[PDB]
Amino acid sequence: AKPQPIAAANWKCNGTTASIEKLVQVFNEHTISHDVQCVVAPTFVHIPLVQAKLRNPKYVISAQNAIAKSGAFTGEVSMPILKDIGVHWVILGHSERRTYYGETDEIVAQKVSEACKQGFMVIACIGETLQQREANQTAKVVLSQTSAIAAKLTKDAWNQVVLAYEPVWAIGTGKVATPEQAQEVHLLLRKWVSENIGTDVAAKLRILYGGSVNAANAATLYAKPDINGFLVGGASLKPEFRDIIDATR
Amino acid sequence: AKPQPIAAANWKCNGTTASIEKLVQVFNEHTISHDVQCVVAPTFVHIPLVQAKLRNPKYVISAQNAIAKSGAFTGEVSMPILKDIGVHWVILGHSERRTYYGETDEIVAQKVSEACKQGFMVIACIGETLQQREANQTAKVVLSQTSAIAAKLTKDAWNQVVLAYEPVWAIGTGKVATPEQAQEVHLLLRKWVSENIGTDVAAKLRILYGGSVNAANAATLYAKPDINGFLVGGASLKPEFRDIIDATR
Numbered sequence: 001a002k003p004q005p006i007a008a009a010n011w012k013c014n015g016t017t018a019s020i021e022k023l024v025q026v027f028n029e030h031t032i033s034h035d036v037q038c039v040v041a042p043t044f045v046h047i048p049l050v051q052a053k054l055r056n057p058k059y060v061i062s063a064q065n066a067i068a069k070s071g072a073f074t075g076e077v078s079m080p081i082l083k084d085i086g087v088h089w090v091i092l093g094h095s096e097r098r099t100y101y102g103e104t105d106e107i108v109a110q111k112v113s114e115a116c117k118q119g120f121m122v123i124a125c126i127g128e129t130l131q132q133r134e135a136n137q138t139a140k141v142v143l144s145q146t147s148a149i150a151a152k153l154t155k156d157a158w159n160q161v162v163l164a165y166e167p168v169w170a171i172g173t174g175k176v177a178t179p180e181q182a183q184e185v186h187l188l189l190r191k192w193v194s195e196n197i198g199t200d201v202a203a204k205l206r207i208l209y210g211g212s213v214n215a216a217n218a219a220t221l222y223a224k225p226d227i228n229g230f231l232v233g234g235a236s237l238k239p240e241f242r243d244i245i246d247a248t249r
Numbered sequence: 250a251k252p253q254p255i256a257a258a259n260w261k262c263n264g265t266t267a268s269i270e271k272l273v274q275v276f277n278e279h280t281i282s283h284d285v286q287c288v289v290a291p292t293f294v295h296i297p298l299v300q301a302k303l304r305n306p307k308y309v310i311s312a313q314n315a316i317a318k319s320g321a322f323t324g325e326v327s328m329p330i331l332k333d334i335g336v337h338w339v340i341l342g343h344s345e346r347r348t349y350y351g352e353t354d355e356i357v358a359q360k361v362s363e364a365c366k367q368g369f370m371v372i373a374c375i376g377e378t379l380q381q382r383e384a385n386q387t388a389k390v391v392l393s394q395t396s397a398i399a400a401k402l403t404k405d406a407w408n409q410v411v412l413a414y415e416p417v418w419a420i421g422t423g424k425v426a427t428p429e430q431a432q433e434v435h436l437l438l439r440k441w442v443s444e445n446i447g448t449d450v451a452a453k454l455r456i457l458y459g460g461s462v463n464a465a466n467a468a469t470l471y472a473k474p475d476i477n478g479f480l481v482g483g484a485s486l487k488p489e490f491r492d493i494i495d496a497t498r
């Protein structure tokens with residue numbers, strides 16, 4: 001009795017208007033016949049184009065990042081600005097931003113909290129590095145990341161949260177986690193949520209896997225009992241995202 | 250024989266589609282009767298709206314930031330993506346990004362270089378802090394910032410560069426630099442450019458002032474011989490930006 005799956009396309013910093021037009025038509029022409037929330041997260045400047053072209057009723061549009069408040073923050077996009085333009089999903093804490101762009105656990109947690117307060121659905125990203133994995137620290141790391149987020153949330157806010165477990169060593173590298181690796185982590189995360197947040201919350205929570213998901217490995221990942229779908233980078237730029245969606249059947 | 254002035258609106262992280270519609274109509278209905286490049290820099294998600302609504306022929310649209318290359322940079326917008334959507338102006342190195350968002354001199358210089366290579370007009374921001382000012386380090390600081398940028402540029406690339414001198418203590422604080430303060434810095438910057446880059450380059454270079462510019466203080470700033478216009482934050486969200494433009498006559 002899994003909760004509704006999610007298939008989320010993180011386009012990252014990629015696209016042209018011609019390429020996006022073509023890919024959106026692919027997405028539109030793919031009839032989805034099961035209950036799944038599809039998400040596409042274009043770059044900020046592409047949000048209006050995607051809003052204008054995307055019509056598949058299974059989809060919503062997400063931002064790839066945000067800051068909490070409007071103001072004197074040259075170059076950034078705030079949560080109120082996104083809400084006003086009709087975007088009410090956001091990806092927060094992607095490894096890329098934790099690594100390159102200074103986002104500590106505290107900063108990610110604050111952003112997630114603020115997003116929930118503003119009515120967003122949030123895909124909050126967590127995951128260990130290769131060195132953490134090899135040091136047998138996977139569980140400690142993902143639980144610390146999750147706990148940091150949880151410390152700024154009320155119980156009710158969790159209804160807006162989606163966790164995305166993405167081992168850093170699997171992101172963009174062609175080294176997907178095995179089904180067993182992912183399931184082990186999703187199980188421990190769900191147990192933590194059950195015990196620390198609530199048993200109801202844990203049963204409803206979507207915990208997505210990401211890191212080198214493709215159309216050929218997705219269904220076997222999805223067969224694991226605590227995997228609720230995917231956060232997809234490279235493969236989401238391609239027509240084979242259709243089969244990743246259908247791997248959540 | 251000043252070069253063509255620039256009046257640039259840095260909206261920062263502000264706007265709604267309703268507020269932007271209204272302000273763009275104000276800008277459109279203001280007939281400008283002198284040679285000036287007006288620039289408006291909306292948030293990324295607002296670029297398409299501004300592109301659709303802005304018609305005043307004196308204007309171009311700028312990004313408030315960018316990264317050099319497309320790829321696995323969740324949340325960021327690249328220079329090729331901006332070029333493809335029709336944006337070929339960018340503000341780089343704003344204090345807000347140097348201060349909050351990790352942009353060192355090296356990072357700013359690299360971004361400016363890459364933007365010039367990709368055909369952008371670049372508004373490159375420099376300026377000292379209050380503590381640097383009080384330590385008599387203003388000239389050392391702005392010349393170091395400018396030199397860092399220059400080290401990554403060819404002579405020809407300077408035709409695409411605009412400098413914006415914004416003392417950090419003047420940004421958003423209601424403490425504008427005096428005309429004499431700004432002119433002293435613009436003079437020393439232009440002399441450095443003349444001697445280190447070329448006398449032709451220096452004569453053509455626009456050096457803008459920013460930091461608490463408003464419609465009432467702009468004309469007296471513009472009267473100074475080495476001030477070529479303005480990078481405007483708060484006042485650019487208001488109808489009085491019209492009079493800031495006209496203060497460059």
Ligand SMILES: *C[C@H](O)COP(=O)(O)O
Nearest residue numbers: 171172210211212233234
């Ligand atoms: C959530 C991570 O973005 C996935 O990137 P991948 O290219 O799918 O590895």
Ligand SMILES: *C[C@H](O)COP(=O)(O)O
Nearest residue numbers: 420421459460461482483
């Ligand atoms: C270039 C600086 O953005 C200007 O901000 P101000 O609000 O005009 O001080």
